[PDB]
């Protein structure tokens, strides 16, 4: 019988997995998977195998895998966009949730379903309209998404005491609704702040999520949308260990609904040391250009970089807590630029920084990863198509990141993952424990 | 020379600690402090020694310690309130930050300084006023605090590239400002939602934080305020392992400012499995009373409890992820009730549940901790003094929790704790790792 629907494919998957993990655990749960040292406890779990997080895994040399699907693999296999060359973010979502590579037909369903669900409640539209213009786009986003929780189906089934065993099904509704709304929140922000007077207009059921987004942003450039598909897809997910994913995961585990847990993830992504580096790169470049001037040398270029390190500041967009090579999401962005915007001054600068920064970082002998990460390359692309308002960039990272984070949330919950609740120590107790005892 | 100021006492403390940890780590950082099993990874870090968290530590038998200061110890040593019998929350804060038991004189400074800082920006006052009346108080709180980030001194010193080494000093300003504002946010919510038409009025520099709070709530009862001091103090902090503290800690570590990280902590506290149990207890009791009727027997009382367990629901306010006995914060609440409200029907019910629940939980053979936690006893006290709007209760938990969470944030940052970034695995990789490899 019938046609397409991810929640049924989920319904079929979940029990098989539920069984799979229980055998595995019934046999291998005792197994020491690794040890904890005291440096690990002071180093922010650096090295720690903390979680189980299904929808992707980060390799220190290779970089991310979406099943065992590398970014090059995703680039060629996922459905493009019916006259395009970038993966549709939709079918990354389907991959993530389902482990399977979508069919064209699956993805139109995703597109159209996200379009169906895409509406904003009057109060969120109110709040958005009154927000101050010195309130950071990330702050605006987060607030909105916390406010939207009003409309959580989960939070309402939970208050009405459902059976634990149907949590996922409700957490799936909210996730699918969150994802649909998100570009309406985001594009309302961009529109209030930077396009005063104008409206985000109507979502068209015949477009893909990316295109309706760029339309609501007000971008007509064909290639911008393509840039958009590629952007939203590579920023999707980055294992569970990273602050934003781990936040949602943590807060999720207390059975806070999908809006609440996502907006917590947002006040993580707005960390300078996290997704706010997007922005931070461009502010840094921009200053470099002013302060260090137009067409600098590899010798002056280094003077600028040392003036930062010598100031007890960080060089944005460089380094990573797990990758030990160049981010493939960096390479992927570089390719695009080589392809579409090669003569762009800012690009040429970012390409010359790649020549210099990792050697300066290697010289300083501090950084364990002197190589660039996604954030190093992202803003230069946006800049090019007239997206010059760099304080908003993290919100795009934010819209994309929902895809990975809410894909896992549905599994977390369909697998019945507990309250994440580690143990803590004070240095005092630590000092007495390992040595004193 | 001169008079009182915590930031100088901090300034003196920090280097000593900074040195202390570096020796300790230079010598004992290698030390295996514990191991990770695969059950631990699927059990939400249950058992895992994750973090270093200074301001308190949770013992599984004894329960919390604020230095090595147990709740009974705090009850007798901390400055009361110049004609009271409950610890002033202020001097719990001083203890937490400084490790020292405050002097009366320290605490008046705290009181008066918190009063100084206590103002809300027009936009937050706007947003608050427009919020819908079906938007949960916790959602309202969180949103507001994310919105307040506008006013972060940290976030502005960071954009202006300070030296890493002065982070704490800015993170101290914001924390002290957050804590001051908080009861103005909270009391504005209570006032809009439940007291329509009326205003929170003016903070008086001669009152303590607790009293200005109860005044803004509109409570005149002397004993209510005392209840307030005791409440705000025992909910302060609960090591770093718990969702709310761990959220702020996580998001904090990305150098998200103290408002952002706190409101993330809030969408954690609004987890049913976390601080929302406050509320959940009272909804459960209230139903019990309706559904199971006024003065029930120990036999019918058990029928109600089984109808919940048999429904794949949880019994609220019972259990804990680390304590293996009755929460001392439970006992402490029970004492108060014995003292002030012994004939209260709801109390008598909560006292009879203590008789029955842990035996029903012990029978079901599921719960590792069949004993009550703070949330089991809290709402019954509020109820009594006319605070009957149980959807707000978690916000009180929320105001109190800022004290522990922001005390640690200043240390985290003055000690230069890194980005919290554990490693994740999918079951797939896990299955291949321990056994397959
Ligand atoms: C992602 C990041 C947080 C990795 O954290 P990490 O794993 O703890 O970093 P490492 O393991 O490499 O070791 C950290 C040391 O190297 C230095 N380091 C790491 N990245 C650096 C960078 N890009 N520039 C300068 N120094 C850096 C730090 O000074 C630190 O020294 P410390 O112990 O004296 O504090 C990141 O490398 C960083 O701190 N900065 C870049 C983040 C970014 O893009 N920021 C933009 C906003 S300014
Ligand atoms: C704090 C809490 C999350 C502890 O988590 P934990 O350490 O993972 O729980 P445990 O180690 O005791 O083991 C959990 C098992 O015991 C049961 N359990 C724990 N607390 C229970 C409670 N109060 N009522 C019923 N069952 C409970 C769970 O069914 C679970 O079974 P499962 O593996 O089939 O899912 C808590 O005990 C809980 O789940 N519920 C109470 C939280 C609360 O106050 N909620 C109010 C809103 S309804």
From Swiss-Prot, chains A, B:
Per the UniProt record, which EC number(s) apply here?
2.3.3.1
Tell me which UniProt keywords the record has, alphabetically: Acetylation, Methylation, Mitochondrion, Phosphoprotein, Transferase, Transit peptide, Tricarboxylic acid cycle, Ubl conjugation
Name positions with the PTM N6-acetyllysine: 49, 294, 300, 348, 355, 366, 432
Its post-translational modification remark reads: Methylated. Trimethylation at Lys-368 by CSKMT decreases citrate synthase activity. In response to mitochondrial stress, the precursor protein is ubiquitinated by the SIFI complex in the cytoplasm before mitochondrial import, leading to its degradation. Within the SIFI complex, UBR4 initiates ubiquitin chain that are further elongated or branched by KCMF1.
Q: Where in the cell is it found?
A: Mitochondrion matrix
Q: Name one GO molecular function term.
A: citrate synthase activity
Q: Which GO terms describe its biological process?
A: carbohydrate metabolic process; citrate metabolic process; tricarboxylic acid cycle
Task: Give the multimer and partner information.
Answer: Homodimer.
| Name under which the protein is recorded | Citrate synthase, mitochondrial
User: What is the scientific name of the source organism?
Assistant: Sus scrofa (Pig)
Gene (name only): CS
């Amino acid at each position: 019988a019938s046609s397409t629907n991810l929640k049924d494919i989920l319904a079929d998957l979940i029990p098989k997995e539920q069984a799979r993990i229980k055998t595995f655990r019934q046999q291998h749960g005792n197994t020491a998977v690794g040890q904890i040292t005291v440096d690990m406890m002071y180093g922010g779990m650096r090295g720690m195998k903390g979680l189980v997080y299904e929808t992707s895994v980060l390799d220190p040399d290779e970089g991310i895998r979406f099943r065992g699907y590398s970014i090059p693999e995703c680039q060629k296999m996922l459905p493009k966009a019916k006259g395009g060359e970038e993966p549709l973010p939709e079918g990354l979502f389907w991959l993530l949730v389902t482990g399977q590579i979508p069919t064209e037909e699956q993805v139109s369903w995703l597109s159209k379903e996200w379009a169906k669900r895409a509406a904003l409640p009057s109060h969120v539209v109110t709040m958005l309209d009154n927000f101050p213009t010195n309130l950071h786009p990330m702050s605006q986003l987060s607030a909105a998404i916390t406010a939207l929780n009003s409309e959580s189906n989960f939070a309402r089934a939970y208050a009405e005491g459902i059976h634990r065993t149907k949590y996922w099904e409700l957490i799936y509704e909210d996730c699918m609704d969150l994802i649909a709304k998100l570009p309406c929140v985001a594009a309302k922000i961009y529109r209030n702040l930077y396009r005063e007077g104008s409206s985000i207009g109507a979502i068209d059921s015949k477009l893909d999520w990316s295109h309706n987004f760029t339309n609501m942003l007000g971008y007509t450039d064909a290639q911008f949308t393509e840039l958009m598909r590629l952007y939203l897809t590579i920023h999707s997910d980055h294992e569970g260990g990273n602050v934003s994913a781990h936040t949602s995961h943590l807060v999720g585990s207390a059975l806070s609904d999908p809006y609440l847990s996502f907006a917590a993830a947002m006040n993580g992504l707005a960390g300078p040391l996290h997704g706010l580096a997007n922005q931070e790169v461009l502010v840094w470049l921009t200053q470099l250009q002013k302060e260090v001037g137009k067409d600098v040398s590899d010798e002056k270029l280094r003077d600028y970089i040392w003036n930062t390190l010598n100031s007890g500041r960080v060089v944005p967009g460089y380094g990573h807590a797990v990758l030990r090579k160049t981010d493939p999401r960096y390479t992927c962005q570089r390719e695009f630029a080589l392809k579409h915007l090669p003569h762009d001054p800012m690009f040429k600068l970012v390409a010359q920084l790649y020549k210099i920064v990792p050697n300066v970082l290697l010289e300083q002998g501090k950084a364990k990863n002197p190589w660039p990460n996604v954030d190093a390359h992202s803003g230069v692309l946006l800049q090019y198509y007239g997206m010059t308002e760099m304080n908003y960039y993290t919100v795009l990272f934010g819209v994309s990141r929902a895809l990975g984070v809410l894909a896992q949330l549905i599994w977390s919950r369909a697998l019945g993952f507990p309250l994440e609740r580690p143990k803590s120590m004070s240095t005092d107790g630590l000092i007495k424990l390992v040595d004193s005892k």
